[PDB]
Design a protein around this ligand. Structure first.
Ligand SMILES: CCCCCCCCCCCCCCCCCC(=O)OC[C@H](COP(=O)([O-])OCC[N+](C)(C)C)OC(=O)CCCCCCCCCCCCCCCCC
Ligand SMILES: CCCCCCCCCCCCCCCCCC(=O)OC[C@H](COP(=O)([O-])OCC[N+](C)(C)C)OC(=O)CCCCCCCCCCCCCCCCC
Ligand SMILES: CCCCCCCCCCCCCCCCCC(=O)OC[C@H](COP(=O)([O-])OCC[N+](C)(C)C)OC(=O)CCCCCCCCCCCCCCCCC
Ligand SMILES: CCCCCCCCCCCCCCCCCC(=O)OC[C@H](COP(=O)([O-])OCC[N+](C)(C)C)OC(=O)CCCCCCCCCCCCCCCCC
Ligand SMILES: CCCCCCCCCCCCCCCCCC(=O)OC[C@H](COP(=O)([O-])OCC[N+](C)(C)C)OC(=O)CCCCCCCCCCCCCCCCC
Ligand SMILES: CCCCCCCCCCCCCCCCCC(=O)OC[C@H](COP(=O)([O-])OCC[N+](C)(C)C)OC(=O)CCCCCCCCCCCCCCCCC
Ligand SMILES: CCCCCCCCCCCCCCCCCC(=O)OC[C@H](COP(=O)([O-])OCC[N+](C)(C)C)OC(=O)CCCCCCCCCCCCCCCCC
Ligand SMILES: CC(=O)OC/C=C(\C)CCC=C(C)C
Lengths: 406, 357, 388, 406
C-alpha cells in the first residue's frame, strides 16, 4: 500500500478486525478467506443488533417511573451512535474508499520534497497520537462501565402487587446493562454468558463509534498538514521568481513550481469536499442523537445529590457525549483556521520583488484562499468549535432553567 | 508611558531585574492570600456574610494571580511588541484615556483602602477588629489586639488591594497603548501610500507594503500576548457580574450584611471597565483596514506602471478583510461581545437569586 | 413555445387549468375562449373565498373552549397560505412572466452546445421529479383528509364550515361534502404548484451554474499557449463572451426569482410561524393514538415539508453559486494567455458573493433558516412541556 | 443655497423654527436676531426640561402599585428620546454641519449630467415623501394623545387613609400627562394652562425626535441615490472605453469620466463615514432606551383584556416604538444593499468588449465595492433590517414567555 492508506494503516486494520463490513485493503482474496470474513462480520452485526434490541425491550416493558424511562432512554440513545455508525460505514464504504484514495499518485515537487517529508512526518505523528488517545479512552470507558456495576444495589422499582399505589425494590441481576434475555440471566451460566456478552458488546460498540470519529479526525489532520505544507513553501516559491542579478529555464522552473502548488491546493479542496460527502450525514445523525442525549442528561444532572453511583454515571455520560462532539469540532475548526490563513501566508511573502507570474499567482491565491474550507454536516451546520460552544451553551442554559423552574 | 514603563520593568522585559523581584514578591503575596482565603472558606467556621466575603476575596486573588502569571509567561512577546512600539508613539486620545484610567485606579484603590476605617468610625454597633473593619478578609493568624496590631494588619491587607489595582491597571493600559501603536503605524502606512500615489514611486509603495506586513506581524504578536487576559476577563466578568448583582440585590433586601456592597460596588466597577476597554478598542481595529482600502482606490491607479497596479490590487485584496481580534477560536473582541456577555450575566443572576430565595 | 416556458410547460398548464388568473401562454386568443376562461377563474375564486369566509364564520361564532379555538385558528391559517398565494399570483403575473421570459432567446455557444444539452435535460428531470413528488403528496393530502374524518351532534364534514343551508341531512350534506372536497383539492393544488414553480426556477439556475462551471476547463485548454494566433484570440474572446453572458444571465435570473417570490415567502413565513406556534402548543396534548395525534402530526408534517422544499433548494443554490470559484481555480489558468488571466481574476472577484434568495431583505432562504425554525419550534415545545 | 442644504431646506427650516440650537443657514445675522433666536431656543429648552422633570416627579412621588410605576416609566422613557435628541443635536451641530456640506462644490460630469439629474430629483421625491409621512405620523400621534385623555375615567389609585390595607380611587385632572405642577392644575386657569403646556410639550418633543430621525433618513436616501447614479453610469462609462472601430480625444474623455466616477464614489464613502460619525451615538442611545421601553411594553401587553383605553395606549406605544426603529433600519438596509451591489453592476457591463483600461477599471471597482457601506451605532451594532428583525423577535419571544409563564 501507499499514500493515505499507509498512513492510516493501523486505523484500517482496526476497522477490519473490529467487524465492520470492509472488503478492500486485504492480501488474501481467496474464496475461503472471503467467506470466513463475511461470516465473522455478519455474526458481529447479528450480535450487536440483537443486544441493542434486547436493551430496547428492557426499556419499555420494565420501565415504570419517569426516572427509569430517562435512564433507559439515555443508555439506548448512547448506543444508538454505534448502531447508526455500523450501518453507515457498512453500506457506505464507497465514499470512504474514494476519500482514502485521493492522495494516491501525488508526489512532491523536487524543490519542496524536504518540506513535504517533514509535514508528512508531523501528520503521521498526530494520527498516531490520536489513535493512542482514542484507544485509551475506549479501554477506560469499558473498564469503568464494568467497575460502576459493583458499587450500587442491584434493585429495580416495580409497583407493589399487594397494595394499590406503592412501589417495592426487587433484586435484579448485576450486569453492565439492563437488558432482557431469552434465558435466565439471574444466576449461573446464564449470568456468566450475559456478563461476557455485555462486556463484548459495550467494548465493540464503543470501538465502532470511536473508529469512525478517529478516521474523520485523521482525514482532517492530513488535510490540515497538507495546507501547512502549502503555506510554508510559499516563500521559496516566490524567491524562485526573484530577478536578482528571468531566463527561460528560470521561467519554466517558476511555472512548474506554481503548477505544483496549484495542483496540491486543488487536491486539498477536493479532498475536503470528499470528506464532507463521506462523513457529512454521519455528523448530522450524531448531532441529532446527542441533542436528545444532552437534554435528558441535563435533566438527570438536575437530580444529582451527594456522591454515589448516579452522580458518577451522569457525569460520565455527559463527559463522553461532550468529548465525542469536541473531537470532531476541534479538527473542523483547525481546518477552517488553517485554510483561512493561506491568504495571510501568501501576502506575507516577498511577492513585491517578484515576477509578474508570481504576482498573478499571489493575487489569485489571495482571491480564493479567502473563504475558509468548511466541513459541513449534511449542509445543516459547519463543523467547528462554534458548534461545540453553541451546544455547551444550550446545555448549560437548559440545566439552569431546569434548576430554577423546578 | 507612566504605567507602560512600570509594566515593562516589572514584566522583566527591561534590563533592570529589581522590578522582576517586586513582581515575584507580589505573586508570592497573592498566592499566600489565595491559600489563606481557601483555608478560611473550608477549614474554618464562618457565617454566611463572611462566606460571601471570603468567596469574593478568593476570586479576586485568583484573578490577580492569573494575570500576573499571564503577563510573566509572555515576556519575550511583550519585549517584541515594545521593540516595535519604540519608533512611533500613540494617538493623543489614547494617551489621555490611559492617564484617565491611571488616575481612576489610584483614586479607587485609595478610597477602597480607606473606607474600612470610616466604617469603623461610624455605625457604633461595630468596632475595630472584627469582620468588616479591614480592606481584606481577616486571614492573618494574629488575633485582634491594640491599635498597633490593628494598623499593622490593616496595612498588610491594604497591600493586597494595592497589588490588585496595580495588576488591573497593567492590563487596562497596555491594551490601549498597543492598540494605539497599531493605529498610529496604520495611519503612517496610509500616508506613505498617499505619497506613493503622487510620483508613480513603485519603490515607495514597496516600502508601504513592507510596513503593512510588519504591522500584520505585530498584530499577530499582540493577539498572542493578549489572548489569555482577554478570555480570563470575559469569563470572570460574566460569572462575577452575576454573583455580585445577586449579592447586591440580597443585601438591599437585607438578607446579608449591607457593608458587602463596599466590595460589590468596587470589584464590579473595576470589572465592567476591564471588558469595556477590551471590547471597545477591539472594535477600533476593524475600522483600520478601511483606511488603506479607501486610500488605495484612486485615479492615480490608472497612470501607474502596470506592475504598480498588481501590487495595488494585491494589497487591496488583503485589506478587504478587517483586523479581527479573535481569541479562544470562538470569540471576536468587539462591542457585540459586550452586548452578548450581559445575557449570560443575567442568566447567572436569575439562577443565583432563585436559589438564594 | 421555447425557453423556460417550454421546459416548464406542465406546471404552467396545470396553473392555467387550476383557476389561477393566467392571460398569456394560450393559443386560443378568441372572443369566447378568453371570456369563458375569465368566467371560470372568477367562479373558482368566488368558491375558494366563500369557503374561506365560511370557515372564518365557524371559527368565531361556534368556538367556545381554548382548544377548539386553537384547532380553528390552525385550520384557518393552514388554508390562509393558499388564500394569500391565489391573489399573490393572480395580481402579480407580470413578475412571473418576466421570470419565464428571462430565458427566451438564449442560445448556447457552438463549442459548448453538447454540454448545455447534458445539463438542459437533467434539469428537466428534476423539474419533473419535483412535479411528481408534489403530485403525489397533494393527492395523498386529499385522500388522507377523507380517511381521518370517519375515525372520530355535528354533521361529518372534512371542514367545520358554516353554511346558509342545513348541511346535516339530505342533499345538503352531500353538496357540502363535495364542495369541501373540491375546495381542499384546489387550495392544496395552488399552494403546492406555487412552491413547485419556485423550486423549478431554483433547479434551473443550479443546472445552468453547473454547466458554466463544467465548461471552464475546455475554455482554458483552448486559451492555453501549448505548443496565440489571431484565430485563437478570436475563439478565446468568443468563449469569454459566452461564459460571461451566461453567468450574467444566471445572476439576472436569480434576481428575478428573488423579486418574483420574495414577499410571498415573507408572508408564508409569517403565517407559518404562528401556525407552528399553535401546533407546538397542541403537540403537548397527545393522549395516544387517536384523531388528535394524527391531525397534529399531519399538520406539522405538511407545514414543515412546505418550508423544507424551498429551504433545501435555496441552500443548494447558495452552495452552487459559491463553487464557481473552485471551478475557475480548477482550470489551468497558469497556462492561459494574459486576457484569460484577467478574465479568471474578475470571475474570482465576482464569485466572492454566493447567490442567495432573500425573503424581502428580512431573511435568507437556506437550510439554516429551516434549522432555526425547527429549533425554535422544538424549544417552544420543551418550554411548554416543562411549564405544564 | 446650494448642495445638500438646498435639498433638505424644509427640514432645516423646520429645525430652526422648532427651537433646536441651530445657528447656521440664516440670512439675518444681526445683533438682535441672533439674540432673539438664542432666547427662543433657551426658553424652549427650559420649558421642555422643566416639563420632563415634572413628569419624572409625578412618576416617583405619586406611584404606589407596580402597574402605575410601569405606566409612568413607559411615558418617561418615551420622552427621554426627545430629551436626549435635543441635548445631542444642540451640543453636536458641528457634525451635522459637516455632513450637510459634504456635497457643496461637487458637479456632475457633462457626459453624465443627464442621469445625475434623473436621480437627484428622485432623491428629492423621496425626501419630500419622508417629510410628509412623518409630518402626519407626528401630528396624528399628538391628536390621538389629545383624544385618549377624554375616553377614560381620570382616577388615580392611592392607599386609603382610613383603613390599613385598602386602596381607593381619587379623581385626578384630565390632562394628557400625569405631571406635577407648582400651581393647582385641577380646575380653571391652572387646568387650562396645564393642558395647553402639555399639548405644546408633547407636540414639540415629538417634533424634536422626528426631525432628527428624518434628517438621518434623508442623509441615507441621498447616499443611496448617489450610489444608484454611480451604478447606472457604469454602462456608458464602459462603452466609452470600447475599442469599436483609443484616440486622444477618446482617451481624455474616458480618463475624465473615470476620474469623475472614482471621485464620486470616494465622496459617497466619505459621506457615509460622516453620517456614522454624526448620528452614530444617537442610534445607540435610541436603542438603549427602546430596549427598556419594549421590555416594559411587552410586560404591559400581557395585561390587555378586550378593548379599552389601556389596550389602545399600549398598542400605540408599541407601534410608535417599532415605527421609530423601522424608519432608520429600512434606510440603513437600503444603503447596505445599494453599496454591496455596485460590483454586480460593474460585472454586468461589457468589460470583455473593452480595452485594457475598461478591464482594469472593472477589476479595481469590483475589488473596492465588495465590502458594503454600513452605518453603525457607535460600532455597537449595524443599522439594517436585521437589527429590526432581531428586536422584534426578542420582544415577541419575551411576550410569549410572559404569557405562558403568567
Ligand atoms: C444540543 C443540546 C441542547 C439541549 C436543549 C435542547 C432543547 C431540546 C431539544 C431536543 C428535544 C428533546 C426531546 C424530548 C426529550 C426531553 C424529555 C425530558 O427531558 O423531559 C423530562 C422527562 C422526565 O422528567 P419529568 O417530565 O417527568 O419531570 C417531572 C418529574 N416528576 C414526574 C417527578 C414530577 O424525561 C423523560 O421522560 C425521558 C425522555 C422521554 C423519551 C424522549 C424521546 C425523545 C424523542 C426525540 C424524537 C426526535 C426529536 C428530534 C429532536 C432534534 C430536532 C432538532
Ligand atoms: C489529552 C487528551 C485526552 C484527555 C482529554 C479527553 C479525556 C477523555 C474525556 C472523556 C472520557 C470519559 C470516559 C469515561 C466516561 C464514562 C462514559 C459513560 O458512559 O459513563 C456511564 C457508565 C455507566 O453508566 P450506567 O450507570 O448507566 O450503567 C451501569 C448500569 N447499572 C446502573 C445497572 C449498573 O460508566 C461510568 O459511570 C463511569 C463513570 C466514571 C466517570 C469518572 C470521571 C472522573 C471524575 C469526573 C470528573 C469530575 C470533573 C467534572 C465534573 C462535572 C463537570 C460537568
Ligand atoms: C468558565 C468559568 C471561569 C471562572 C473564572 C475563574 C478562573 C478560571 C481560570 C480559567 C479561566 C480561563 C483562563 C483563560 C484561558 C487560559 C488558557 C488558555 O489560554 O486557553 C485559551 C484557549 C485557546 O487559547 P488561544 O486563543 O491563545 O490559542 C488559539 C490561538 N491560535 C489559533 C493562534 C493558536 O481557548 C479556550 O480554551 C476557550 C476559552 C474557554 C475559557 C474561557 C471561557 C469563556 C466563555 C465564558 C462565557 C462567555 C460569555 C460570552 C460568550 C459570547 C460568545 C459565545
Ligand atoms: C424524495 C422526497 C421524499 C420526501 C418528500 C415526500 C414526503 C413528504 C413528507 C411530508 C408529507 C406531508 C403530507 C402528510 C400530512 C398531511 C397534511 C395534513 O394536513 O394532515 C392533517 C389531515 C387532517 O387534519 P385534521 O384532522 O386537523 O382536519 C380534519 C378535521 N376533522 C377531523 C374535524 C375532520 O390529515 C392527517 O391527519 C394526516 C395524518 C397522517 C400522518 C401520516 C404520517 C404519520 C407518521 C409520521 C412520522 C412520525 C413523526 C416522526 C417525526 C416527523 C418525521 C421525521
Ligand atoms: C435572557 C436575556 C436577558 C437580557 C438581560 C439584559 C437585558 C435587559 C433588558 C432591559 C431590562 C429593563 C428592566 C426593567 C423592565 C423589567 C421587566 C418588567 O417586567 O418590569 C415591569 C415592572 C413592573 O412589573 P413586575 O416586574 O412587577 O411584574 C412581575 C410579574 N412577572 C414576574 C410575571 C413579570 O415595571 C417596573 O418596575 C418599572 C421599571 C423599573 C426599571 C426602570 C429602569 C430604568 C429607569 C429609568 C427611569 C427614567 C430615567 C429618567 C428619570 C430618572 C429618575 C431617577
Ligand atoms: C433606560 C436606559 C437608561 C436611560 C437612558 C440612557 C441613555 C443615555 C443617557 C445619557 C444621555 C447622553 C446623551 C447626552 C449627551 C449627547 C451629546 C454627546 O456629545 O454625547 C455623545 C458623546 C460621544 O462622543 P462622539 O464622538 O461619538 O459624538 C458623536 C457626534 N456628536 C458630537 C455630533 C454628538 O459622548 C457620550 O457618549 C455621552 C456621555 C454620557 C454617556 C451616557 C452616560 C450613561 C451611559 C448609559 C447608562 C446606562 C447604560 C446601561 C447599559 C446596560 C446596563 C445593563
Ligand atoms: C406608506 C407608509 C404608510 C405609513 C407607515 C407607518 C405607519 C405609521 C406607524 C406609526 C403609527 C403610530 C400611530 C400613533 C400611535 C400613538 C403613539 C402613542 O404614543 O400612543 C400612546 C398614546 C396615549 O398614551 P397614554 O395612554 O399613556 O396617554 C394618556 C394618558 N392618560 C391615560 C392619563 C390619559 O396614544 C394612543 O394611545 C393612540 C393609540 C392608537 C390611536 C388609534 C386611533 C384612535 C384615536 C382615538 C382613540 C379613542 C378610542 C379609545 C377608546 C375606545 C373605546 C373604549
Ligand atoms: C478583577 C476584579 O474584579 O478585581 C478587582 C478588585 C477590586 C476592585 C478590589 C480589590 C480588593 C481586594 C483584593 C480585596
Amino acid at each position: 500500500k501507499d499514500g493515505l492508506i499507509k498512513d492510516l494503516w493501523p486505523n484500517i486494520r482496526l476497522i477490519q478486525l473490529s467487524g465492520l463490513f470492509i472488503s478492500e485493503y486485504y492480501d488474501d482474496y481467496s474464496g475461503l478467506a472471503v467467506l470466513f470474513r463475511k461470516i465473522y462480520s455478519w455474526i458481529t452485526a447479528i450480535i450487536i443488533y440483537s443486544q441493542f434490541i434486547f436493551i430496547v425491550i428492557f426499556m419499555v416493558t420494565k420501565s415504570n417511573d419517569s426516572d427509569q424511562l430517562a435512564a433507559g432512554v439515555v443508555t439506548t440513545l448512547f448506543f444508538t451512535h454505534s448502531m447508526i455508525k455500523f450501518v453507515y460505514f457498512s453500506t457506505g464504504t464507497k465514499s470512504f474508499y474514494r476519500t482514502l484514495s485521493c492522495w494516491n499518485n501525488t508526489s512532491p515537487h523536487p524543490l519542496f520534497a524536504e518540506s513535504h517529508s517533514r509535514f508528512h512526518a508531523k501528520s503521521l505523528s498526530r494520527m498516531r497520537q490520536l489513535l493512542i488517545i482514542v484507544s485509551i479512552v475506549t479501554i477506560f470507558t469499558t473498564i469503568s462501565w464494568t467497575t460502576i456495576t459493583f458499587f450500587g444495589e442491584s434493585v429495580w422499582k416495580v409497583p407493589d402487587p399487594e397494595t394499590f399505589n406503592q412501589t417495592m425494590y426487587v433484586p435484579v441481576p448485576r450486569l453492565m446493562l439492563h437488558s432482557w434475555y431469552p434465558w435466565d440471566s439471574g444466576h449461573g451460566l446464564g449470568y456468566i454468558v450475559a456478563f461476557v456478552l455485555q462486556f463484548y458488546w459495550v467494548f465493540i460498540t464503543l470501538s465502532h463509534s470511536n473508529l469512525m470519529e478517529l478516521l474523520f479526525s485523521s482525514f482532517l489532520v492530513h488535510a490540515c498538514e497538507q495546507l501547512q505544507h502549502l503555506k510554508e513553501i510559499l516563500n521559496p516559491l516566490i524567491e524562485l521568481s526573484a530577478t536578482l542579478d528571468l531566463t527561460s529555464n528560470q521561467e519554466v522552473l517558476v511555472r512548474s513550481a506554481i503548477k505544483y502548488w496549484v495542483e496540491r491546493h486543488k487536491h486539498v479542496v477536493k479532498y475536503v469536499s470528499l470528506i464532507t460527502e463521506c462523513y457529512g450525514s454521519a455528523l448530522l445523525f450524531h448531532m441529532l442523537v446527542s441533542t436528545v442525549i444532552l437534554t435528558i442528561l441535563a435533566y438527570q444532572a438536575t437530580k444529582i445529590n451527594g456522591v454515589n453511583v448516579f452522580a458518577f454515571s451522569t457525569i460520565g455520560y455527559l463527559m463522553y457525549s461532550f468529548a465525542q462532539i469536541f473531537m470532531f469540532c476541534i479538527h473542523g475548526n483547525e481546518l477552517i483556521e488553517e485554510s483561512s490563513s493561506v491568504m495571510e501566508a501568501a501576502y506575507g511573502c516577498h511577492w513585491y520583488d517578484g515576477s509578474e507570474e508570481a504576482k498573478t499567482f499571489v493575487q489569485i491565491v489571495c482571491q480564493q484562499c479567502q473563504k475558509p474550507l468548511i466541513v459541513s454536516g449534511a449542509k445543516f451546520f459547519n463543523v467547528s468549535l462554534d458548534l461545540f460552544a453553541s451546544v455547551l451553551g444550550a446545555v448549560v442554559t437548559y440545566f439552569m432553567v431546569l434548576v430554577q423552574l423546578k | 508611558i507612566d504605567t507602560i514603563n512600570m509594566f515593562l520593568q516589572m514584566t522583566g522585559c527591561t534590563d533592570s531585574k529589581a522590578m522582576l523581584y517586586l513582581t515575584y514578591f507580589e505573586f508570592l503575596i497573592t498566592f499566600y492570600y489565595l491559600i489563606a482565603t481557601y483555608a478560611s472558606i473550608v477549614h474554618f467556621e464562618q457565617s454566611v456574610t463572611i462566606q460571601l466575603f471570603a468567596l469574593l476575596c478568593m476570586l479576586i486573588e485568583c484573578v490577580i494571580l492569573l494575570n500576573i502569571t499571564f503577563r510573566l509567561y509572555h515576556k519575550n512577546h511583550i519585549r517584541e511588541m515594545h521593540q516595535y512600539s519604540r519608533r512611533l508613539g500613540i494617538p493623543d486620545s489614547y494617551r489621555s484615556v490611559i492617564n484617565v484610567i491611571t488616575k481612576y485606579h489610584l483614586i479607587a484603590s485609595n478610597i477602597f483602602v480607606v473606607f474600612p476605617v470610616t466604617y469603623a468610625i461610624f455605625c457604633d454597633s461595630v468596632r475595630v477588629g472584627d469582620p468588616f473593619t479591614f480592606p481584606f478578609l481577616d486571614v492573618l493568624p494574629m488575633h485582634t489586639d491594640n491599635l498597633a496590631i490593628y494598623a499593622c494588619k490593616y496595612l498588610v491587607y491594604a497591600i493586597s488591594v494595592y497589588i490588585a489595582h496595580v495588576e488591573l491597571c497593567f492590563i487596562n493600559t497596555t491594551f490601549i497603548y498597543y492598540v494605539g501603536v497599531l493605529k498610529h503605524r496604520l495611519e503612517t502606512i496610509v500616508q506613505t501610500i498617499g505619497e506613493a500615489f503622487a510620483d508613480n514611486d513603485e519603490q515607495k509603495f514597496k516600502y508601504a507594503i513592507i510596513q503593512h506586513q510588519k504591522l500584520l506581524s505585530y498584530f499577530n504578536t499582540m493577539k498572542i500576548v493578549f489572548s489569555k487576559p482577554i478570555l480570563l476577563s470575559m469569563s470572570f466578568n460574566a460569572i462575577y457580574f452575576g454573583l455580585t448583582t445577586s449579592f447586591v440585590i440580597q443585601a438591599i433586601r437585607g438578607y446579608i450584611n449591607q457593608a458587602i456592597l463596599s466590595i460589590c460596588i468596587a470589584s464590579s466597577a473595576a470589572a465592567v471597565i476591564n471588558i469595556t476597554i477590551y471590547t471597545f478598542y477591539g472594535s477600533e481595529l476593524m475600522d483600520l483596514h478601511d483606511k488603506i482600502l479607501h486610500v488605495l482606490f484612486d485615479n492615480a491607479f490608472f497612470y501607474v506602471s502596470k506592475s504598480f497596479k498588481s501590487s495595488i490590487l494585491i494589497m487591496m485584496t488583503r485589506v478587504t478583510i478587517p483586523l479581527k481580534f479573535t481569541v479562544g477560536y470562538i470569540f471576536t473582541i468587539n462591542l457585540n461581545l459586550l452586548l452578548k456577555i450581559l445575557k449570560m450575566s443575567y442568566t447567572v443572576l436569575n439562577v443565583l437569586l432563585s436559589s438564594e430565595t
